[PDB]
Amino acid sequence: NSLEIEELARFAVDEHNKKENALLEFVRVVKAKEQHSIDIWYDFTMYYLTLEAKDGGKKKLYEAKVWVKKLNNSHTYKNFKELQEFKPV
Amino acid sequence: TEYKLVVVGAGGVGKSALTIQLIQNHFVDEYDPTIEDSYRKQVVIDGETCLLDILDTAGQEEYSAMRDQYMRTGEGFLCVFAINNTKSFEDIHHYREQIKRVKDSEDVPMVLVGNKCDLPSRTVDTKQAQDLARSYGIPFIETSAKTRQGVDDAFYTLVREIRKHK
Ligand SMILES: Nc1nc2c(ncn2[C@@H]2O[C@H](COP(=O)(O)OP(=O)(O)O)[C@@H](O)[C@H]2O)c(=O)[nH]1
Ligand SMILES: [Mg+2]
């Protein structure tokens, strides 16, 4: 339903690679789920993504959790994006 | 019988002062602005013995599992501004938006509160607040956490609003 699923997935792969000194190549998202929290000011969303990535050639699945703080009264700046979990399956 | 209420508004409008005046019946000058917590008080409203469960919100910049629960299960909302701070009055529109959004509903029990009406001066015109409240289709009540002015009326009006929508 989100129009930033593929983007958040790439962010996940990137952030994993960054943190874990890896070089996974993002292929695509196979499953996505949302946990949307409308708060008094910001919106917070936990994204649960199952993505395909290539690990020095071979295609593997990874489940990623991405945490997103986003505002609907002023663009960016106090927005935020964070990989919480990223594990092979 | 419980009424779950949520008190919202920019920091420094007197959310805590209002809440503590209704619960403990005294004015607290300097309440830690970071402290968010729920408080319960049994009261009588229009001959009804009932329990009010009130979340005094604080720290809107960080996610709160507590606030999350009360946004979902809260029955009514006090949107508070300060009558001597225009910014707090402007923030009201976004608070209301987020409450409508979380309930997916225009028709959420809600009372607009103009706090600090004890002060001899004011910056936000009364008629402006009345005009806004009317546009939203909600009650507007002027309060003073310092003098206790309109505090009972603020929370009870909300309970009456919640009663209407049941
Ligand atoms: N004069 C006056 N001061 C108030 C009133 N309510 C709160 N205050 C003061 O305004 C400041 C912020 O109050 P607080 O309840 O902590 O605001 P909150 O951040 O919304 O919880 C404090 O210094 C309070 O003493 C009021 O009705 N009248
Ligand atoms: Mg407070």
Numbering used by the authors:
A (entry chain B): 4 to 92
B (entry chain A): 2 to 167
Cite, word for word, the article reporting this structure.
The RAS family of small GTPases consists of four members, KRAS4A, KRAS4B, HRAS, and NRAS, which act as bi-directional molecular switches that cycle between an inactive GDP-bound form, and an active GTP-bound form. RAS mutations are the most common oncogenic drivers across human cancers, but there remains a paucity of clinically-validated pharmacological inhibitors of RAS, as druggable pockets have proven difficult to identify.
The underlying reasons for this were confirmed by determining the crystal structure of Affimer K3 in complex with the GDP-bound form of KRAS to 2.1 Å resolution, however, crystallization of this complex was difficult leading to lower than anticipated Rfactor and FreeRfactor values (see “Methods” section for details). Affimer K3 binds KRAS with high affinity irrespective of the nucleotide bound (KD = 59.4 ± 15 nM for GDP-bound and KD = 44.4 ± 0.8 nM for GppNHp-bound). Variable region 1 binds KRAS between SII and the α3 helix, with residues 41–46 being crucial for interaction and inhibition. The involvement of Affimer K3 residue W44 in binding H95 may explain the specificity of K3 for KRAS seen in the biochemical and cellular data, as H95 is a unique residue only present in KRAS and not in HRAS and NRAS.
